Design an enzyme around this catalytic site. Structure first.
Site, PDB file in Angstrom:
ATOM      1  N   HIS A   1       0.812  -1.221   0.000  1.00 21.79           N
ATOM      2  CA  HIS A   1       0.000   0.000   0.000  1.00 21.79           C
ATOM      3  C   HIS A   1       0.850   1.278   0.000  1.00 21.79           C
ATOM      4  O   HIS A   1       0.320   2.371  -0.214  1.00 21.79           O
ATOM      5  CB  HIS A   1      -0.996  -0.035   1.172  1.00 21.79           C
ATOM      6  CG  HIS A   1      -0.416   0.416   2.469  1.00 21.79           C
ATOM      7  ND1 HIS A   1       0.035  -0.472   3.426  1.00 21.79           N
ATOM      8  CD2 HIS A   1      -0.217   1.655   2.976  1.00 21.79           C
ATOM      9  CE1 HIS A   1       0.510   0.206   4.456  1.00 21.79           C
ATOM     10  NE2 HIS A   1       0.362   1.497   4.213  1.00 21.79           N
TER      11      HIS A   1
ATOM     12  N   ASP B   1      -0.158  -7.487   2.040  1.00 20.73           N
ATOM     13  CA  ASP B   1       0.334  -6.121   1.901  1.00 20.73           C
ATOM     14  C   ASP B   1       1.857  -6.179   1.821  1.00 20.73           C
ATOM     15  O   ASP B   1       2.570  -5.858   2.775  1.00 20.73           O
ATOM     16  CB  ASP B   1      -0.118  -5.286   3.089  1.00 20.73           C
ATOM     17  CG  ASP B   1       0.059  -3.824   2.876  1.00 20.73           C
ATOM     18  OD1 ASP B   1       0.399  -3.407   1.735  1.00 20.73           O
ATOM     19  OD2 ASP B   1      -0.096  -3.087   3.878  1.00 20.73           O
TER      20      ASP B   1
ATOM     21  N   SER C   1       4.451   2.858   7.969  1.00 19.23           N
ATOM     22  CA  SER C   1       4.065   1.791   7.054  1.00 19.23           C
ATOM     23  C   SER C   1       5.267   1.306   6.251  1.00 19.23           C
ATOM     24  O   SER C   1       6.143   2.090   5.877  1.00 19.23           O
ATOM     25  CB  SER C   1       2.977   2.309   6.100  1.00 19.23           C
ATOM     26  OG  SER C   1       1.765   2.642   6.767  1.00 19.23           O
TER      27      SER C   1
END
Ligand SMILES: *[C@@H]1O[C@H](CO)[C@@H](O)[C@H](O)[C@H]1NC(C)=O
Lengths: 249, 31, 17
Positions: free
Chosen positions: A43, A99, A197
């Protein structure tokens, strides 16, 4: 990182910073697994709900960095990307299942005191360490609350039993995720947050003294909320895809 | 396929030095 | 004591992050 502390020099020498080239902006964390390959979250590169679709010519990585804005010449190396690879069954629509993404550098980077790759777990290591209550380490330059830091941040967090993870969120959890963080009654705090992230969740094997990357910072609901937990890509479960990608290209 | 020297930090494991919080990991694995 | 996730290989607004 929320409720963390400043990293020591060379404490996380596999840390990678992912930057957009122009305009320059910090995008994500990442990790070094070989002299040509960088692991991150899908992502960070592809997220259609936000019109996010970065390809190779939009990006750079900074390796060996400790300050966040300072350009540490001679101590950090800036690398261009040859190709990126998003897991072909990455599910951005529902829950960020799988992910995960790989990035191949245009030139191999030289290892140093500040640049050194992290290990990927084998089956014995994963079964030994990926247990509820066992703590891993998360690092990043992301926000400290839902400000930004001057130095790479680090926080240690316990893996949480999967039934507690499921009960904590309305998102459907897959086998390719685990969650980590302190429960409301444990007193200590800490979480990843926006900007962390793609960075690594690492654990140190008592069996051979080596650091292993078990997870990728994926998502959470807020940062450090009581009763909410950060979710991590289950690197071991996807290890055969990583090896397939690296072996073909 | 995994590189032979991975996971050993030049400034810590290779110098037989521990960082300020890695014991907290090990304690969670044992206690 | 319990695994935080299965130890096997993958076969085949979500959060504020
Ligand atoms: C991402 O952008 C590229 C432009 O380089 C485009 O060719 C590709 O189709 C896009 N991928 C998407 C929208 O999934």
């Amino acid at each position: 990182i929320v409720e963390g502390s400043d990293a020591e020099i060379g404490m996380s020498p596999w840390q990678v910073m992912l930057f957009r080239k122009s305009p320059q902006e910090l995008l994500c964390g990442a990790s070094l697994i070989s002299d040509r390959w960088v692991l991150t979250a899908a992502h960070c590169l592809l997220y259609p709900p936000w019109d996010k679709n970065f390809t190779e010519n939009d990006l750079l990585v900074r390796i060996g960095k400790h300050s966040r804005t300072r350009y540490e010449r001679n101590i950090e190396k800036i690398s261009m990307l040859e190709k990126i690879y998003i897991h072909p069954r990455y599910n951005w629509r529902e829950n960020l299942d799988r992910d995960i993404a790989l990035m191949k550098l245009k030139k191999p980077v030289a290892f140093s005191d500040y640049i050194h790759p992290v290990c990927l777990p084998d089956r014995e290591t994963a079964a030994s360490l990926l247990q509820a209550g066992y703590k891993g380490r998360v690092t990043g330059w992301g926000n400290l609350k839902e400000g930004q830091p001057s130095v790479l941040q680090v926080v240690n967090l316990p893996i949480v039993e999967r039934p507690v993870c499921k009960d904590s969120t309305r998102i459907r959890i897959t086998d390719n995720m685990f969650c980590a963080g302190y429960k409301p009654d444990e007193g200590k705090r800490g979480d990843a947050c926006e900007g962390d992230s793609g960075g690594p969740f690492v654990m140190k094997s008592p069996f051979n003294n080596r650091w292993y990357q078990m997870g990728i910072v994926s998502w959470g609901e807020g940062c450090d909320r009581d009763g909410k937990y950060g979710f991590y890509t289950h690197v071991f479960r996807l290890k055969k895809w990583i090896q397939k990608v690296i072996d073909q290209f | 396929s995994g590189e032979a020297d991975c996971g050993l930090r030049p400034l810590f494991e290779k110098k037989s030095l521990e960082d300020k919080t890695e014991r907290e990991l090990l304690e969670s694995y044992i206690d | 004591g319990e695994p935080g996730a299965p130890i096997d290989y993958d076969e085949y607004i979500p959060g504020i992050r």
